[PDB]
Amino acid sequence: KKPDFTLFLQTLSWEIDDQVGIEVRNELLREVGRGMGTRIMPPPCQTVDKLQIELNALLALIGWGTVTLELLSEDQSLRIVHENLPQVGSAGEPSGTWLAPVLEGLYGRWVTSQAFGDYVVTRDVAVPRQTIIMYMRV
Amino acid sequence: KKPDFTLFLQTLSWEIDDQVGIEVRNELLREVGRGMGTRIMPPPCQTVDKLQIELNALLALIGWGTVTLELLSEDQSLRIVHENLPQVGSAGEPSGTWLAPVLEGLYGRWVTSQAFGDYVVTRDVAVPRQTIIMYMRV
Amino acid sequence: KKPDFTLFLQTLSWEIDDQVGIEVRNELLREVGRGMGTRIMPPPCQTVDKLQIELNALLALIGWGTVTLELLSEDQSLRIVHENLPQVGSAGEPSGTWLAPVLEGLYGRWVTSQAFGDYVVTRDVAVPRQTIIMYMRV
Amino acid sequence: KKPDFTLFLQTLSWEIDDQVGIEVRNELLREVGRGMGTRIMPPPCQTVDKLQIELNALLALIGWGTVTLELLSEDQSLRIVHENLPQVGSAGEPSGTWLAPVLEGLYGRWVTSQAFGDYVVTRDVAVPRQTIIMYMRV
Amino acid sequence: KKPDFTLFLQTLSWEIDDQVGIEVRNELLREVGRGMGTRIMPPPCQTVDKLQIELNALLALIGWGTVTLELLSEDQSLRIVHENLPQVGSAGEPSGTWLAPVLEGLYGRWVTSQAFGDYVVTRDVAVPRQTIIMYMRV
Amino acid sequence: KKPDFTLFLQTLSWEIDDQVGIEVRNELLREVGRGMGTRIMPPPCQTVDKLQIELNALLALIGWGTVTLELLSEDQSLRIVHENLPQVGSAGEPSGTWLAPVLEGLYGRWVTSQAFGDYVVTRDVAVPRQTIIMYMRV
Amino acid sequence: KKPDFTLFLQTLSWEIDDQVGIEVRNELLREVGRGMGTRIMPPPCQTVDKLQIELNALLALIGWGTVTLELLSEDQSLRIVHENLPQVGSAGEPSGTWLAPVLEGLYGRWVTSQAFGDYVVTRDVAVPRQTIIMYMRV
Amino acid sequence: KKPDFTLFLQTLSWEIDDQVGIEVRNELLREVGRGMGTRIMPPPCQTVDKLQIELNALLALIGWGTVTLELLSEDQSLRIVHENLPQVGSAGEPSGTWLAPVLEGLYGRWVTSQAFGDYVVTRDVAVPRQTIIMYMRV
To answer: Which chain G residues are closer than 8 Å to E6 by Cβ?
Structure first.
């Protein structure tokens, strides 16, 4: 049987919350996501739709959900909607969204690598519990 | 598709190794294992064989390997052999054995709860890479 | 192949119904559920939403369905709705709901352990066949 | 996810052991196996090898192990060896063999229905833990 | 890998259609279904709902679809609706319904064995392609 | 759930054995195998090793065991060894080998299509029960 | 674990696009599909519905989607709608439809082999991304 | 059902062999492997054992086999043994080893990126059919 890490991640999340706090762990998770973004990378794309397809394939390779990218031309900003985020335990704000900084760092690396190449990710916090909305503005 | 946490655990292990060190993370993993031992517990058993069967069933519930308990009557000690440890990344001493303190804390809780009830676990470090030997002496 | 226990449970349910009756088996199933509640426990939670999120994870660990907790503030009561109950045979009132006292005991243990800690479970009998409604009042 | 009944069967076995005893439950399990033998039946066979093949197919239909029949011509007896019995908990004599009377009743029904048709089952208790040997004598 | 018999059944159906005809094969399939009804039987039930619940479990044991029984009290008839029939090839009237006499014989045996015990099955031929309606009148 | 045809094939084999005999069904199975050989074909190969590699891929596409081809240069004959033949029921000579004429026709078509192109298959009857040996001589 | 060829196909598609162009690869894919159509063929059918059923069974054998055939009697043309095309990378016009000439050649071979036997396939380019419409006119 | 690309790869391999030759396709496959090595990369390692563990994890992520690295200190060379190569068709020298240049380029990229960083891969052609031996010398 393939090992299951859900209970281990729940206990680790509770222990990290009780130990360091709710602000250092965000930076730690962002760094973890940035490091994860180095192992798997998308090919260089020229249009938003191709980038969306490649990122969806990369996410389906590991099964962490689906992504939707939109380009707001009012200020040339990027809106990213992530669906079916994995749920571990009941920690985070709101409860169940504990792996959001990981997505922030991962998407920042993936988009800045190619779209454009000078942006910063800021999480925007009736959407479902597992839906994460982020903005990519210069 | 069920989410896969292997790459996330590898990156997290590397980051934790680079940040805190190789001694604080051992205590953190021991605390994580002790907390994990509270969520699932075996029923109170009277003999070593029944304890072995119950612990094997509990391990197979999550798929973290197999266990073998044997009692040394020379000093009434307990020897625990764990097989098929999950492997994440290449961190630990030796490489690949990163989740050993978790097993130490888990087995300590499981055995001390019931055999006897006053023991301490100390890791004993041509056995395979994924085989861990621990001792339970008063 | 993993063993299948459905036919065995159907035959056992029929035999137990034919032997002891329809009132002793309810107490037996309640005791079985109370004993099951000792093997797996949820972490201590402070709010109803966190309790729901944890109980859903424990239920999904074994695949026995889904739970929904709600609080009536009129008399500070708790309403629990369980969905996708396992079906074995055609025994019970109504037919197919044979494992309801098990849920009663399990939920009583899980909630009383932490919400509050002084409550009793009483089954409330156009809802589907596999949906069970229970009340937790002092 | 398909429901898992392993923990439920372990708790039920412990409760039944603590409630009635270790002799009434044997008769209950024999009756359960006899009732189980009525739901699934093998076709009428004329030779021992065909009976073995049909019983192996029937067992593989549910995944309860493998069977081997051999005829002792000294007293026209039948020896049955069952392998890979399902293991639930740590109850029974020896530990892990809790569903042996079920096999006794099931095999008695299956063979007596057709080989011959006048025999009784008596369990014969360095074989493995999950191997059960039974004898069919008139 | 578990063997696949779909192509073999398609070729066999074509050959049987080309050899004997479209009337002898119906009797052959009815006899095959009647023989199949002996290997697996439902427990004796007293009401229509319990019979439906037991037959649904029996069908799900092999995965041949779902059944729905309803009693017309005008002439004390029984109407059976079968859904999700297996499809092999493109033979039968209409195309794809090649295993209908098997269901006729199987349901006749299953119902007549217990509801009542004196009935005959006659196939009633905007329903989907895989839906079969049968009547059970004395 | 994918439908299971094992019990249906067992009942059909028994009925066909009881109805026509043990010689007409062999011709029927040979014709069925010859028709099956038309749906799936191997690419034209020049050497025996390439033919073996292709035939193994086609067999694994449906999971009907494995094949091994040898060329005896004493009289330019071909020896074919088939392993892991599917087992249905207990019919055939010997018991358990009911789909051997299907293999005869299938291999005849597959080899004669390309090796050479003028041969006839004749079954050669301490090898296991599911191993079939055939010869391909002009 | 069964090998995964998705990333290999993505890289191969990108390299082929960068090397030969966007017109030679179409002929290459058409030839590949025509060669694929030789390995697996449907049985000769007389009506459109039977052809549709057989082609759907053949497609489900490999899992490449679903097909729908409909005959325009105005000019005796055939319209083919293919659903759930496999997606590899982000190449093709539109992005994601890289295996369309393969379907063109495959369907041309399959239909022309039997409906009628003199037709040519021409791709017709608010339908979804993975839906392909083709026409079969003389 | 997840799409299967085995038949497509076999037909594509045959067509590429028939069109360009047996020398241009080697360069094409090497370029494909080099491009594949960019999508997934191992973390920078300092010792051979850690590199072996990381490469094995990366290979198991896609299921393309296992790797074994060993350093000859006579001339500081590196020997790489790959096991369980995927098999498509019967093309290549020897038959079945069609994807060897892909592994050559992939391993060259993976090792040269970090061990050392100045090496070239040259394939060394009673080992099994799917085992490939490569050398990494400056």
So the answer is: 57, 61
Structure tokens at E105: 């014989």
Determine if the peptide bond prior to G94 is cis (ω within 30°).
yes
Chains that touch F (3 or more CB pairs under 8 A): D, E, G, H
Query: Tokens standing for G132?
Result: 């392909």
Q: What is the Cα–Cα distance from F30 to B97, expressed in whole angstroms?
A: 58
A132/A104 Cα distance (integer angstroms): 10
- The answer to whether the Cβ–Cβ distance between C89 and E45 falls below 8 Å is no
Q: How far is residue G74 from each of residues G47, G68, G71, G77, measured CA to CA in Å?
A: 18, 19, 9, 8
Instruction: Name residue, tokens 């709860």.
Output: B113
Resolution of the entry in angstroms:
3.3
With beta carbons less than 8 A apart as the criterion, state whether B36 and B103 touch.
no
Measured distance CA(A110)–CA(A45) in Å, rounded? 11
Residues 6 or more apart whose Cβ sits within 8 Å of residue A117:
none
CB atoms under 10 Å from CB of B87, counted, come to: 21
Contact D40 E40 (CB under 8 A): yes
Secondary structure string (H, E, C) spanning chain F: CCCCCHHHHHHHHHHHHHHCCCCHHHHHHHHHHHHHHHHECCCCCCCHHHHHHHHHHHHHHHCCCEEEEEEECCCCEEEEEEECCCCCCCCCCCCCCCCHHHHHHHHHHHHHHCCCCCCEEEECCCCCCCCEEEEEEC
Residue H68 is encoded by which pair of tokens? Answer: 């074994």
User: Which chain F residues contact residue D43 at CB under 8 A?
Assistant: 10, 14
* CA-based nearest residue in chain D for residue F89: D54
Which position has the token pair 């960068």? G18
**E-interface mutation test, from D32, D39, D61, most E Cβ less than 10 A away:** D39
Name the token pair of D124. Answer: 């014969």
Q: Which of H 30-69 lie inside 8 A of A, CB atoms?
A: 38-43
Residues of chain G with C-beta less than 8 angstroms from the C-beta of F39: 40-43
Kindly list the residues from chain G whose CB atom is less than 8 angstroms away from the CB atom of residue A49: 90, 95
